[PDB]
Design a protein around this ligand. Structure first.
Ligand SMILES: CO[C@H](c1c(NC(=O)Nc2cnc(-n3nccn3)c(Cl)c2)cnc2cc(Cl)nn12)[C@@H](C)OC
Length: 358
């Protein structure tokens, strides 16, 4: 492999269509599995049409001679007269092609590349380019785990075979057999595999030497800067209360913010630091921010990974941020024998985190 580059899109929260649950776990777990295989992974949740189109265009552009690419989409799919389409979260009801991404157009652009390997996997709820196309239609079918999280049928079987040092086409055929044995998808057309692979190529194949090929190092630096998290900060308030702001990442466009009281003077009986007044573009609803647990924000991956007794806020639209992430830390405090709640607030700039750097 000249390089190993992957783009994973998972669409769950649809405006005019039924919401999905499985993409979250699927995208997250496939990201980890591909990271283990030395892929530079971009993982994005809930993308609009324009966001999808730009992400796909940028991923396609990386597909230079000998590069190993992998594109995964989990979400609603649409079929109209032999063509399949990927449905963005902002798509109107009923479905219409102009609002969707045509799969056949992507395949056509992939066909022009001189990639060492190009794996295009769809997990939808309805000279050679070495393209392996997997098209799963059992996505809303999912299984509930002992964790309480929803895992997709396709991903359940894919997770178990991805790390195998075997030709990708052989790997995917075993996944199709597993689904065929699975009682939910038994005698049904759940996975279609299309392949134009003339060479024994696997996702486990090594990346070309950095002592002569510097494009992997350049793309590694460019990937790294798109995954930068703000360093944790401490804010001091006039009353004497010291607050810590902590940051965790779930996906390339999803960040969890948490606040905790590091010092509370004896005179203050009860205090809480609430993060508010986020940029409009991010579309955060205050009724889904400052939660007592990360689970209540929709963050189930990174859960006992975070400090206890904090307030948690999930920023899942970082790709929409077109300025610095400037928000307010509002402190609400109470003196034991005093009338009510005293409020104090200070603005914070955490720059352009993660995908917002690009
Ligand atoms: C070329 O850039 C890299 C890249 C991708 N680029 C994007 O996703 N671009 C993107 C552009 N615009 C938007 N968008 N925001 C608002 C409106 N449109 C969005 Cl959601 C995404 C996609 N796939 C991979 C895989 C690897 Cl490795 N890198 N890579 C990387 C450095 O990106 C992290």
């Amino acid at each position: 492999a000249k390089d190993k580059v992957a783009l994973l899109i998972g669409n769950m929260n649809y405006r005019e269509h039924p919401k999905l649950k499985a993409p979250l776990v699927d995208v997250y777990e496939l990201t980890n599995l591909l990271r283990q295989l030395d892929f530079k992974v971009v993982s994005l949740l809930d993308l609009t049409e324009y966001e999808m189109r730009n992400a796909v265009d940028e991923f396609l552009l990386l597909l230079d001679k000998g590069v190993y690419g992998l594109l995964y989409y989990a979400g609603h799919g649409y079929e109209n007269f032999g063509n399949s389409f990927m449905v963005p979260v902002d798509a109107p009801n009923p479905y219409r092609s102009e609002n969707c991404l045509c799969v056949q157009n992507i395949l056509k652009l992939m066909q022009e590349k001189e990639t060492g390997l190009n794996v295009f996997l769809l997990d939808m709820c309805r000279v050679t380019a070495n393209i392996v196309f997997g098209y799963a239609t059992c996505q809303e079918a999912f299984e509930i785990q002992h964790s309480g999280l929803a895992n997709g049928i396709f991903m359940k079987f894919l997770k178990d075979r991805l790390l195998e040092d075997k030709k990708i086409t052989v790997l995917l055929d075993e996944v199709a057999e597993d689904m065929g044995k699975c009682h939910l998808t038994k005698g049904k057309q759940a996975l279609e595999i299309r392949s134009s692979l003339s060479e024994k190529r696997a996702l486990t194949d090594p990346i070309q030497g950095t002592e002569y090929s510097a494009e992997s190092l350049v793309r590694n630096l460019q990937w790294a800067k798109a995954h930068e998290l703000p360093e944790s900060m401490c804010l001091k308030f006039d009353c004497g209360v010291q607050i810590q702001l902590g940051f965790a990442a779930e996906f390339s466009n999803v960040m969890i913010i948490y606040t905790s009281i590091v010092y509370k003077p004896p005179e203050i009986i009860m205090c809480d630091a609430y993060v508010t007044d986020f940029p409009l573009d991010l579309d955060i609803d205050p009724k889904d921010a400052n939660k007592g647990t990360p689970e209540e924000t929709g963050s189930y991956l990174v859960s006992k990974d975070l400090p206890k007794h904090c307030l948690y806020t999930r920023l899942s639209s970082l790709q929409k941020l077109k300025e610095h992430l400037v928000f307010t830390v509002c402190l609400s405090y109470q003196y034991s024998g005093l009338e009510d709640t005293v409020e104090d607030k200070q603005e914070v700039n955490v720059g352009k985190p993660l995908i917002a750097k690009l």
